Amino acid sequence: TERGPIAAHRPHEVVFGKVEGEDRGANPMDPPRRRVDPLFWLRDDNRADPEVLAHLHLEKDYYEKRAVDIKDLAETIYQEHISHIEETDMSAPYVYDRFLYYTRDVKGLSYKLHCRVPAGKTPGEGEDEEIVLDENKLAEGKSFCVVGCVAPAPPEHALVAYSVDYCGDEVYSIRFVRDVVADKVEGTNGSVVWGPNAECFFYITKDASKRDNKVWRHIIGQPQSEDVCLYTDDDPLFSVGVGRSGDGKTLIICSMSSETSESHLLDLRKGVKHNTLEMVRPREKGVRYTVEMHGTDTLIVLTNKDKCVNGKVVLTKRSAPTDWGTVLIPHDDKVTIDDVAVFAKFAVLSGRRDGLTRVWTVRLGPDNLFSSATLKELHFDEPVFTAHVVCSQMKTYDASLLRLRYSSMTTPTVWYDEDVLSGERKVVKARKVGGGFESKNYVCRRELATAPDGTKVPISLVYDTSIDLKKPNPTMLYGYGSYGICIEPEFNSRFLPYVDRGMIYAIAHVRGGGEMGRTWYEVGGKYLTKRNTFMDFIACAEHLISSGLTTPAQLSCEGRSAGGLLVGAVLNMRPDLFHVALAGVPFVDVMTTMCDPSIPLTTGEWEEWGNPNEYKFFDYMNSYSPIDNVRAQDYPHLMIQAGLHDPRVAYWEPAKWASKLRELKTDSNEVLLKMDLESGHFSASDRYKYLRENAIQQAFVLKHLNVRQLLR
């Protein structure tokens, strides 16, 4: 009896293929195809059409009427999110020459404070603390302000450089902490790399389309007009970067594209007038590499070369740097190596293996050469987690300690120092989580689903340890995965309102994401294999059901943005698997949007999903496009969040989708559309806002699953 809004049909036709005067791609169908979209009119580029507005106000009214009984729970949940944030905080301090550096956040203030304490003292507010740079002071009276970099000049740290942008154009000027020197450097990308003894520093300028194209040396006490430019790459596929070797003796200059690199070395021992670069390996298309210096004579190179898609690490001499015959760490199908950092006594590798983030360590042999047999992987007790080396906090080249960051669905982020040789760990900073959180109450684990083609898909799940595992329990299954993003099983206080009410909270690491490495995205779920994203997700839900963890009556799912594509297709395919669902700013008008280059992101996104103006993609994309596959079947309760002026998805997509669902669905569940009408074109996010949206959706799920009350 009590149906939500259904929009009147207005015949309109959408054309796919070649259209005079429009850039529809390099190979559009000729002649083109036409299909009817009777709800096309809900789109207004202007966001102001009165008939469109009257319709969305019907949606506002139906939403309000229907959220009456979840308002108080939403507010409880919001209170929970609030209590999880520490407005007063200090970061993990780290040695940097004769100081301990750290950041602080203060209760009433928007920006951080960059602080320092002498070598032997206790980090924190007090007589000992020296406030190096207070961003609130820079920010004062300004509408936009972002610091790119705070950069103390090594040995002494008497000059500290910093970069600031007050414009929002991502161009930064470089200034000095309380004008110790007068020098000012304009037109930079925000980064600052010191040369030795505070004599000079290095910076990068841009040209067309704000592309980083030149590396410069600025000598302190000189006008910028005299800066020497060391390097230029004006190939528009390439961007430049500059870094400093760990021992501080060598500058590393590089050009990078999405698939090709090139590095050059500059000797910093030769003074401010020596500008001649040393070529590492010339540019070769499809060959990626990164260079790190072990001392001054040897390079450790992480590369793609010779089909090592997952990376190999190579050891070469400065005097013959194109000879990459010596493999320190061979390629391995199982292991992904994303980077290396080198120190005097060991190198540290980062990447993934078996779906998780990993860190590896390699030491010196008894002979001062790096040694393969030394390779170890840092091990953890829990089955799913996140772990990273934090080399922004490793400022001392001859260290024995690693600085590490661990986080898990059980464990708020912990920073610790670990001994490279023994493996002894010492806590530096463990995150505080308020509102009664304690780690011992929770357990996380790994499950493996099996897709139709036989491929194993990992799931990370967490729950409160007091639930009855001898029966099935209310569950939330989250999925993204496009663009090769990994949805990490890291700590996230935002699932606590679920988990604290008896729910199992689960992530499906489906193809399209990047969790299993290189090919999990690029062959696994992209272009004409994209359907794997949805089939994998379903396989995860079925595994959770066949193993006894849940049942369809007690299962929920959610995705946001490109993850909204996932929920949309999955609800057409297997809505029987889910009692209630969420879809934030969901990408659901796939065909009608992807055909049309007038819509802002369309053109770029051809390189993700494909171009339905082309024969190659028309039917395939049409097979999963959510709006296009809505039909007369039972769907679960659903809540859609979107925004009139939100740039994550054009407002009309979720509006068309909700109208269509209500028009054809055969069930009597509710589809709610929470549509922000008030935020404007330039409105900034704001974070308390995101928590308010999170809270009402979570209240929705919790109502429908019948788990309103806290467990403890």
Author numbering: 3 to 714
Task: Please share excerpts from the published article on this structure.
To this end, we have determined crystal structures of T. brucei OPB in the ligand-free open state and antipain-bound closed state. Crystal structures were determined in the ligand-free open state and inhibitor-bound closed state at resolution 2.4 and 2.85 Å, respectively. In this study, PISA identified two potential dimer interfaces present in the TbOPB open state structure, each involving ∼1000 Å2 of buried surface area. One interface involved contacts between the ãβ-hydrolase domain of one molecule with the β-propeller domain of the neighboring molecule, and included a disulfide bridge between Cys169 of each molecule. Without the closed state structure to compare with, it would have been easy to wrongfully assume that the lattice contact was the biological interface. With hindsight the lattice contact involving both domains and a disulfide bridge would impede the inter-domain flexibility needed to allow opening and closing of the enzyme during catalysis (discussed below), and therefore could not be the biological dimer interface. Fortuitous crystal contacts have presumably stabilized these more mobile regions in the TbOPB open state structure, resulting in complete electron density for these previously disordered regions. Domain separation pulls the propeller residue Glu172 out of and away from the active site. Whilst not directly involved in catalysis itself, this residue is responsible for fixing the crucial Arg650 in the appropriate catalytically active conformation in the closed state. In the open state, and in the absence of Glu172, Arg650 adopts a quite different position in the active site, binding instead to the catalytic triad Asp648, which in turn displaces the catalytic triad His683 to the surface of the molecule.
Oligopeptidase B (OPB, EC 3.4.21.83), an enzyme belonging to the prolyl oligopeptidase (PREP) family, has recently emerged as a virulence factor in T. brucei and other trypanosomes, and is a potential therapeutic target. OPB hydrolyses peptide substrates of up to 30 amino acid residues in length, after arginine or lysine with a preference for arginine and most efficiently after a pair of basic residues. The overall structure of TbOPB comprises the typical 2 domain α/β-hydrolase and β-propeller architecture that is present in all members of the PREP family structurally characterized to date. A short N-terminal segment (residues 1–87) and long C-terminal segment (residues 436–714) together form the α/β-hydrolase domain, whilst the region in between (residues 88–435) forms the β-propeller domain.
